[PDB]
Amino acid sequence: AKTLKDLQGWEIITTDEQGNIIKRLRRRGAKTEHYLKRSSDGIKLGRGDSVVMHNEAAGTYSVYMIQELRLNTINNVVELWALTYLRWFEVNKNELYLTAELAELQLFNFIRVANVMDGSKWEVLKGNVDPERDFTVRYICEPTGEKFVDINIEDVKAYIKKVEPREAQEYLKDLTL
Amino acid sequence: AKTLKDLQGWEIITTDEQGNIIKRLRRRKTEHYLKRSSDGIKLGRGDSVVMHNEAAGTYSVYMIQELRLNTINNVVELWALTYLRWFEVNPLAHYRQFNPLNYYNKLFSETANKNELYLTAELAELQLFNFIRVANVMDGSKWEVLKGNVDPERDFTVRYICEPTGEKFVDINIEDVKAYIKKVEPREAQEYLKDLTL
Amino acid sequence: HRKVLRDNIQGITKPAIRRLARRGGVKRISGLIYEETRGVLKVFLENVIRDAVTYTEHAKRKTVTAMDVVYALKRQGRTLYGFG
Amino acid sequence: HRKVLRDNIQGITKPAIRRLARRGGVKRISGLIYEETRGVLKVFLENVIRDAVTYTEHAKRKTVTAMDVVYALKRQGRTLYGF
Amino acid sequence: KTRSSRAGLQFPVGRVHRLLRKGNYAERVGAGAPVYLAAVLEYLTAEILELAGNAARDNKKTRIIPRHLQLAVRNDEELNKLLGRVTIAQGGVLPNIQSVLLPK
Amino acid sequence: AKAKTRSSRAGLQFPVGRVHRLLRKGNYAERVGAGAPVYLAAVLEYLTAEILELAGNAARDNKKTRIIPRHLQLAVRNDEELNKLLGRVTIAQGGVLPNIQSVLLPK
Amino acid sequence: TRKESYAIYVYKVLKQVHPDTGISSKAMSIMNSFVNDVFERIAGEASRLAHYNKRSTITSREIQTAVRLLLPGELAKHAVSEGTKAVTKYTSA
Amino acid sequence: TRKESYAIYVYKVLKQVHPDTGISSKAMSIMNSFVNDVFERIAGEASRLAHYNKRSTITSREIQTAVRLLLPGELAKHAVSEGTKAVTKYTSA
Amino acid sequence: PHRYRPGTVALREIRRYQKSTELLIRKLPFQRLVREIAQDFKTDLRFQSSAVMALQEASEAYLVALFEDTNLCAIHAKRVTIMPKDIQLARRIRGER
Amino acid sequence: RYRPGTVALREIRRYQKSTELLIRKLPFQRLVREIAQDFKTDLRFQSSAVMALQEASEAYLVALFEDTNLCAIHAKRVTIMPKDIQLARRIRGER
DNA sequence: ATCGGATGTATATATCTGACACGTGCCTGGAGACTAGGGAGTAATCCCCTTGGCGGTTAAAACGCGGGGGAGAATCCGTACGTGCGTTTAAGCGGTGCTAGAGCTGTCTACGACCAATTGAGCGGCCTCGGCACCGGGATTCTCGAT
DNA sequence: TCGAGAATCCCGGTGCCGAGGCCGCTCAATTGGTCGTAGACAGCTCTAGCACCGCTTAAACGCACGTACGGATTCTCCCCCGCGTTTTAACCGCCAAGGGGATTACTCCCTAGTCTCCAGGCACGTGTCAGATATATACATCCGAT
């Protein structure tokens, strides 16, 4: 969000490590995590969560993975940093591809929250598939659309949730060379 | 001088080696002095002057050592080493270093010379509205060769260098002091004359 | 989809660090020196570029100009001439 | 006429310099260290006091106050708190 | 009802505004700058005072002397980076002896 | 009557009116006396003349009729006081002075 | 004459973070010098920011950018946060 | 639009010091940066001087004291000279 | 087969790279490095040519000065070979670590 | 009697846990006045002024001694030498 | 290694004391209520300059190998520095006494801000030529292995 | 310390693009006033900086003794330099698209300004309690004897 009137439907929730927090004094060795809750139905977006956004620049829609949550930058009250996915037409139409290319998302383009699984979970759950909600991610490649390296997407979710962004980004960069 | 009109009767002249100037850029040391225009009286480094000390009430002789220019309070500052009058010395120190307090005062005031000054390593800023005339300083030999024609206001002699407290006298050539003041920068000359008596 | 930039710190080649040291009057260079120099240069550039992007963002611009680098350097006590 | 203050840099005694070095984590001290330290301290105080006296004279005062010293120290990149 | 009371702070928003207006920093000063500036100063004072109080209680002293301030500042990385070229009077130094100089 | 620039009254080349404007509107003080711009412009012109003299000597030593930044770096770093004034300053395209330690020399 | 400081405010802050803790007069002067130093740093940086962009006003935006330039690490985070809270209250009351 | 500089003045001073000597654009921009840096330094020091003495005006005395604070050694002396001359001419006209 | 002794070509390179002012790092790798460092602050940034040129000027200046200090630190240990310990000491005295 | 070095380490710990000034007040005040005598004649100093001067000087010298100790250890030594101070002041930029 | 003596230190408790925390009068600075002139928000448009691409050259980078020499380890010697102990010195203190000068005040004047008319100084654009870059050819100055 | 080989240096020739001079042409510097207040300045108050005296005793100085540390010295291993060969991607010239940097114009929001009103915070004063100081008592540590 740029202004304060651009996130009226949302709310910023702060957590110590896993429990809820609502405080000021910089505590020693306690890094605070942030996420944002849409009050319309209490939808929570934090690090690791993959979302679907309306990409009006391409005419289609794009899928991202929230990596970092900058609060109160010197231009945007909230900056949503996310890794980009490569859709099917940039290389099964519900198989995505992770990239280290980052992007800044604005909340007014949010649609739903993508359910990303691997190959085993994709074969296990074939009869109950939703085209606009469930996706599978097996590889990670470059933004150009080549050099595919298979990786468990659940482990990547956990690692983005755990380690700091400035380290995981460089980690994902050197995974394809 | 504090303001410009405080030196209105004077003029600042600078010479580099011999010639005069009426420079801007630096070059590979300029000397400054001030001339009274009513009679062309030149005060430079090493020159001895007499000042009206309105604190003691009498007068006091000084030796110009440095000529600071364009300070943040004075347009021209006149730094000078101080001399010691015959009544500003310690009689006990001279009677113990060379050989009841009133008796030594008697001995000194009767036997000493009225115009024998002594240098000091302490300096005092001078102002031109207390200047009288330029002093002529002799050494040990020239004071004895010139005994008959001695102006009591223009002729003085200095043989020893001592501390301002008036003790620990050390003799040195006063003409060599006049030369050494003009030769080297004041930062080193003041230090040298300071450690001559410790 | 812009071109992915990775391992560009390796672009500071060994002969480049060698030339920089030769200008600094260094006769012999240990092996581990080059990696250390790459790290130190990364730290320096990170600080300067973070401050310059702060200046650019404050001006509500998307193009980092030379004046931003100059202001960041002068803020860090590294005043640079020749760019304004 | 005050007694001439001469070679007061020698007043920075050897035990005082030794204490300063002990605070700085020094175990063994050479001989030339003492005169070297006297010179270093003399240059330091020369610069700082020259700036402080410039500040005092600009205020048309004859007394060097604490604010002059704090301003000089700040001007030389050695900001001092407490005064 | 002072502006410091309206913004829920303890530092004087009015005095900070006066200092910004008459400190020769710019022709005009917005009415939101003193609030933000006083809030930041309050946070910094709070951080230093809380770390100094911790160090003082660890020294079994209920009053904060400059030594507690120096300990709190030099033991905190970001505070020490904030006061790099700054000297705290009556603060001494942190106890640190090199591992080379330990006896054998 | 007729106009007359203050730079002519002071006998300088640097602009006295521009320095006066930069001082009054530069957020330095409430007001600026009429003597500050003259003094400041004079000091700036003197320092510029010093730099330019040393750099022109450095340019003539290479038998070049135009001053390049290398000449400025030579002029600044070979002068003690100018190098002390421009201590924390980087002159772009200036290079370093020809200097090699004693121990690194061949034996 | 009266020469003011930041004593009472630092005392309030100290009693808020540590209710049973006093402070010496020397440490008081140190805290006052620290406050004034940080103030002049932030104000100079905001002034430079306004001057670079040909603006004539020190808004809160310049203060926030100056804080992000001067305060390092997590201090820069929390401080910004605190700066945003006060403003939010001030525009409400 | 117009953005001014010290190019013509630096060129005048150069032709004074070296009549038939030129200067490249990079060196010209370096000279402009130097002039602006010295300006900022002296004007800031004079500003802080006047602010210390509860003064509201920047007189040439503040510039002189700032010069003696900043410029080292003989560079100060000559500079003060070159300042005073200018002033004494301007105050005469 | 003519062959120079170890250290001769080193001193010749010192003299060769001390009398010139050209940038000693390759330009395009440096520009890509600057962009890779800046992409972590704001996405899709643009740079004036003068911006990356000033960055490279300042970077090479800082590295040359640090190398001078590091060589002084190596000589102080009675050595002619700069080592990471010398760089660490140099940046410790400067206050950079 | 202790080995040479034990009393020195005890001095280190003592002077690191304390914050008192390590230089005598009156000789330092005389030094300050002597130095100022070459700048302006007949100057006066508040007690707080000379005290701030002494605090600044002591901080400067102790920090310089820490850097000098590092300079000595870098050369595989445990004794500080004048070349260590000179190198430290050179790296700092004071030289 | 293990154990006793000696040394200085961490530690427990108690005792002054002067520095700190709070009470009080008050006055000068901050708030409330308006107004106004301009700075800043915001949209529209020109156009500059940033991004990107492609092909060919080749100069720089990368790799590898011989080997000189530099870093590092281990040794030996002299001496410089640490550690106590007794003697010498003056720092520190705790008062008094004074007076120079910091500090506050009450004018009153000269000097600087502010605005309107005028222009020529300093800006941007436009050639255009010569100082300098580029390249080659021959001379000079090293470097290094040995008669 | 004498020649063969190899870097650099200096000079002649050619071409190029950037430094310089000049042309209008906006706009900011000048001129010419008026008016407001900042500070120059003499005067009074009175703060505190200078000077001093003697006493106590902690600090500094000098000296004896010994040891451990710095510095010189020899030897050795491997690592970094010189140089040759192969590979690569920097670099230059030329072209095209358009993103976003400036500039302009209109509007209106905001902050300086003032006048009045009042209370927040400071100078002053006072009592009293946490820390500097002290004495003594375990206790860790050092260091040599065994």
TrEMBL record, chain F:
Q: Which residues form the Core Histone H2A/H2B/H3 domain?
A: 1-77
* GO process terms (BP): heterochromatin formation
Q: Which residues cross the membrane?
A: none
Ubl conjugation keyword on record: yes
Is 4Fe-4S a UniProt keyword of this protein?
A: no
The subcellular location is: Chromosome; Nucleus
GO cellular component terms, semicolon-separated: nucleosome; nucleus
Query: Residue ranges of the Histone H2A C-terminal domain?
Result: 80-107
Q: What is its main location?
A: nucleus
Query: Keyword annotations for this protein?
Result: Acetylation, Chromosome, DNA-binding, Isopeptide bond, Nucleosome core, Nucleus, Phosphoprotein, Ubl conjugation
Family, similarity comment: Belongs to the histone H2A family.
Q: What does this protein do?
A: Core component of nucleosome. Nucleosomes wrap and compact DNA into chromatin, limiting DNA accessibility to the cellular machineries which require DNA as a template. Histones thereby play a central role in transcription regulation, DNA repair, DNA replication and chromosomal stability. DNA accessibility is regulated via a complex set of post-translational modifications of histones, also called histone code, and nucleosome remodeling.
* The name this protein goes by in its record: Histone H2A
The scientific name of the source species is Xenopus laevis (African clawed frog)
Part of the intact protein present = 13 to 119 of 130
